[PDB]
């Protein structure tokens, strides 16, 4: 299940999804922020398929690291871990009519490979600084 997959994330984003200041951005309380943007759920899938780099801000703090791709996960595994980070800390509560992540959403985005620099560009297109 998604919680089991999340073990592959926990080393960085931590068991409680609160991250490490300056090093690993929080997921708890921040996934909602992303989902709130038009294109936000697609962006979350792209991070997992293609990785991320570049300076970003989360809850007013700056991050400047690199996240690897997790494309070796299957479509259902990526769907499951994203549902985990969307629900485990209540972020989806904050979001009106959250539909759970599904395998075909991941499949569709795998069809167009992006670089981690292009993933950062997608993040910026969301209105996120
Ligand atoms: C440490 C080696 C990491 C592991 C394992 C995972 N992630 Fe990560 N992630 C990491 C960093 C350093 C960053 C920021 C990169 C930067 O440009 O500074 C991230 C980013 C994310 C994001 C995006 C958050 C945003 O505000 O844009 C998500 C949603 C994300 N990471 C989730 C995630 C998941 C679900 C992982 C396991 C499947 C995972 N990450 C692994 C570092 C590391």
UniProtKB/Swiss-Prot annotation:
Q: List the disulfide bonds.
A: none
GO molecular-function annotation terms?
A: electron transfer activity; heme binding; metal ion binding
Alphabetical keyword list: Electron transport, Heme, Iron, Metal-binding, Pyrrolidone carboxylic acid, Signal, Transport
Q: How is it modified after translation?
A: Binds 1 heme c group covalently per subunit.
Q: Which PROSITE patterns does this UniProt record tie to the protein?
A: CYTC
Q: Where on this chain does heme c bind?
A: 9, 12-13, 67
Q: What does this protein do?
A: This monoheme basic protein appears to function as an electron donor to cytochrome oxidase in T.thermophilus.
Protein name, entry field: Cytochrome c-552
Organism equals: Thermus thermophilus (strain ATCC 27634 / DSM 579 / HB8)
Q: Which gene encodes it?
A: cycA
């Amino acid at each position: 299940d998604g919680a089991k997959i999340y073990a592959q994330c926990a080393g960085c984003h931590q068991q409680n999804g609160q991250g490490i200041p300056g090093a690993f951005p929080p997921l708890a309380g921040h996934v909602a922020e992303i989902l709130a943007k038009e294109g936000g759920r697609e962006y979350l899938i792209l991070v997992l398929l293609y990785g991320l780099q570049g300076q970003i801000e989360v809850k007013g703090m700056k991050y400047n690291g690199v996240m690897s791709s997790f494309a070796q996960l299957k479509d259902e595994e990526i769907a499951a871990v994203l549902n985990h980070i969307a629900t485990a800390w209540g972020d989806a509560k904050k979001v009106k009519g959250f539909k759970p992540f599904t395998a075909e959403e991941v499949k569709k985005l795998r069809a167009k490979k992006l670089t981690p620099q292009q993933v950062l560009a997608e993040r910026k297109k969301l209105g996120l600084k």
